[PDB]
Structure formats: structure tokens, C-alpha cells
Amino acid sequence: AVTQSPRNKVAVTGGKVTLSCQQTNNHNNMYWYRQDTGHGLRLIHYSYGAGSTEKGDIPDGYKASRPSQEQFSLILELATPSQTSVYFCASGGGRGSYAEQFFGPGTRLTVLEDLRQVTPPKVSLFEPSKAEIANKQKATLVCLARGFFPDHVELSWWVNGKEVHSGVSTDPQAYKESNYSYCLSSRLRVSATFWHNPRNHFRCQVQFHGLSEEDKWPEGSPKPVTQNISAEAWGR
């Protein structure tokens, strides 16, 4: 297993950020990569073992630390916008080639001049089009989250209390709609017969990862902390 913390982070330029990687595979080699929309997965720093780190391909602006076999940290002394990215960690046995590696869940890191742009999302649910709700035989619900920033959100569908992945059609990635505003959507298809049953319960769960305690927010306005908003609806 490979874990990373935090999994979401909004930082202010020139600040210090520390992404942490924990492994339980007892592998000697650990890595730190970054992924950029359109571009590839690049190696920043890596380690052959405790007490040592090695410069990857794009080491500039990053420091690494291997306090032990289990832990590998990526330190960003002076955070800058160019460092906005999705970071991936990975442990590796043997020679440490891809087939021998195991990656972490990834970490979204966004660096801004100030955190006053950070905003939670607006979530809305939509009933199927009258058209499809006749000569369609299939009812399709639409869940739309928008107006949020940065793009640290998750959208999940729940019917009758249990999660559902069948029929769900979430957008691959949050499409930006304005400089400081993202937008994501997802559909849930069921049989009209099912959608018309007053007993069935539809719920769109959306989670937005926002500022944390460590994050300092200008008093007065409500600190845009993480949100767990949900749009629900019954049959017919």
C-alpha cells in the first residue's frame, strides 16, 4: 500500500508545502512525480533507501527527504504557481521499473497569489426530460456542480442509500468555465419504471475539499472549508 497526505492542498505563493508519502510494501526505492494536463508524468526526486535521496529529471524547486524506509517527503520551500499540479508518489521493488512500482492515490496541489478566490460549489439535480420519460424507457438524472474553485471535488451517486457505479456517467475531469470557476457534471440512468417508483431515492453526493485549519483565512468572511453537499430526489 502507498498513501499520500495531504490529498488536496491550496497554497499561497512563496509558502512552504510538504507532501508526504507512506508505504507499507517495504520497498527500498521511493519516488515522487508530477502530472500536467496534456503533458506526462515526470520524476522529481527518488530514493534508493533511508537516509538518501536522488535528483530526478525535474528537481529544480523541490527538496526531498527519506527519513526512513516507509516515508518519502517532497518539500517545496518557496511554492510558486508553476508548481500547481497533481503529484504522484510510488514505491518500487527490485530495479524500480514501472512494472515494479506502486503509486499513491495522487495529490492535487494548487498554488495561488492569495486564497480569496477559493469557493465551494453549487450542486443541482435535474429530472429526466419529459421526452425520454415516455418513449425512452430510460430515465436519466443529471447532477451539476459548478462555481467552485479550485477543482478539488468528487461526485458520487447513491440510490436507496447504496452507492451505484452502474449507469453513472461522470465527466472525466472538471472543465474550467472561467478564470476562477470550475464545473463538473454526471448522469445516472435508470428504467422509467424505476424512476417512477415513489419508493426509490436518488442522491447526488458532492464533496469539495477546501481550506484547512493550517490555512489562514482573513477573518470576517466564512472560511471556504471542505463541503459535503448533496442534491436528492424521490420517484415521480
Partner: protein, 221 residues
């Protein structure tokens, strides 16, 4: 060990991963009081059943087979700079640390009051700094002193950092009482490993803590 010439010193700016030297002297050393070997791999080394944050076994390669079997059964005190990558202690089991030298007999080598040794640092041909080193061993290894010297210079003068160094060259000179002096280059070759670098401590060179001097020579970038 006749003094070094400027061209004989290693340039820090020429080291790609100098932070792997930093880690060694920035963190805690491995220290153990009164313990005795438990196993052995090569003829010139001793393995101990001691533990630390990252190990349950410690291996110390000594100067030669002779010195190894010399300390094999005695009760020694351990003080060294350990490394983990490339530390083959066995075939399977791991969680072992490795060092070179750093061994001395424990019985009757301790002092009532710690002996302070003055370290005279000279930066750019100008001996402008002096700070103390402390030890409680009558016969101490140069390694123990070298570590204490570098741990101080790193914490207070940024001798080493997780990255480049403010100094281009540097070394420590040990001046024993009635014996030939010697020194260690503070920086490694452009391409190195902790294990290959730390061989400066393999001969287990010991010093009379009461009658030995320490001089440090640094030049800034």
C-alpha cells in the same frame, strides 16, 4: 597524511547529490555503550544486536581481519555515521544499519568530566572561528570528533544543506600529540555513495582526547 594542496580538495559545486552527505552529518549518529559482537559476515567486520529508529542490527566494517577479531569478544562503545542503501548484513531479514569503524573498548575509557576539545576553524585563510567539541572517552575515534565537528558546522554555519553548500572546499585536520597528523575532505567526488565516502572511518583511527588538536579549513564559493 601530509597536508592537502588546493587542487587536492574536492569542489562541492561539482557534486550532483551533495544532500546525501548532509543527511549523514545533519542527523543523529549511531551511539551504543558497552556491547559485544553477536555475529559477523566478512573477516574484517563485526555485527551487533543493537537498535535505532531504522535498524535492529548494526554492522561495522573495521580496518582488517586482525582488528575485527581483536574487538570480536570485547565490550565496546560504538559511535558512527551509518548508511542504509547497499547495507548487506545477511541474505534476508534486513532492517540493518552499516558503518565503518567507530569502535573502542568501553571499560576504563570514560572520563569523570567530559573533555572539551577546541576546534579552530579557518575560513578563506583566516582562522576566525573557534567552538568546542566534547567527549567523555580517553581514546576517541577521529570519526566521533569529525561527526561532532560537522554536526556543529552544519547547524551553525550551513556547512551542508539539503542541496548546495556555501563552501567550495573544506577539510578537517587532526593533530595528534606525538604522531603524524591527517585530514578528511569535507566533500566527496562528483559521483559518490554514502558507503564509499564513509570509508574514511574504516581504519578505526583513535585519538587521545586529552592530547589531540582539531583544525578546520574552509573556503567560500
Amino acid at each position: 597524511q601530509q597536508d592537502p594542496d588546493p587542487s587536492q580538495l574536492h569542489r562541492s559545486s561539482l557534486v550532483k547529490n551533495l544532500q546525501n552527505i548532509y543527511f549523514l552529518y545533519e542527523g543523529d549518529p549511531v551511539t551504543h555503550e558497552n556491547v559485544k559482537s553477536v555475529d559477523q559476515l566478512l573477516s574484517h567486520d563485526l555485527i551487533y544486536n543493537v537498535s535505532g529508529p531504522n535498524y535492529d542490527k548494526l554492522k561495522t566494517e573495521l580496518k582488517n581481519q586482525e582488528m575485527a577479531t581483536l574487538f570480536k569478544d570485547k565490550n565496546v562503545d560504538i559511535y558512527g555515521v551509518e548508511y542504509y542503501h547497499l547495507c548487506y548484513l545477511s541474505e534476508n531479514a534486513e532492517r540493518s544499519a552499516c558503518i565503518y569503524g567507530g569502535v573502542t573498548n568501553h571499560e576504563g575509557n570514560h572520563l569523570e568530566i567530559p573533555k572539551k576539545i577546541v576546534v579552530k576553524v579557518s575560513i578563506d585563510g583566516i582562522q576566525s572561528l573557534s567552538f568546542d567539541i566534547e567527549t567523555n572517552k580517553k581514546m576517541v575515534t577521529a570519526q566521533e570528533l569529525d561527526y561532532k565537528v560537522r554536526k556543529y558546522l552544519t547547524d551553525n554555519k550551513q556547512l551542508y544543506t539539503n542541496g548546495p553548500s556555501k563552501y567550495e572546499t573544506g577539510y578537517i585536520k587532526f593533530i595528534p600529540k606525538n604522531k603524524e597528523s591527517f585530514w578528511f575532505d569535507f566533500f566527496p567526488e562528483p559521483e559518490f555513495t554514502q558507503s564509499k565516502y564513509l570509508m574514511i572511518y574504516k581504519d578505526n583511527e583513535t585519538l587521545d582526547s586529552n592530547t589531540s588538536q582539531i583544525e578546520v579549513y574552509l573556503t567560500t564559493k
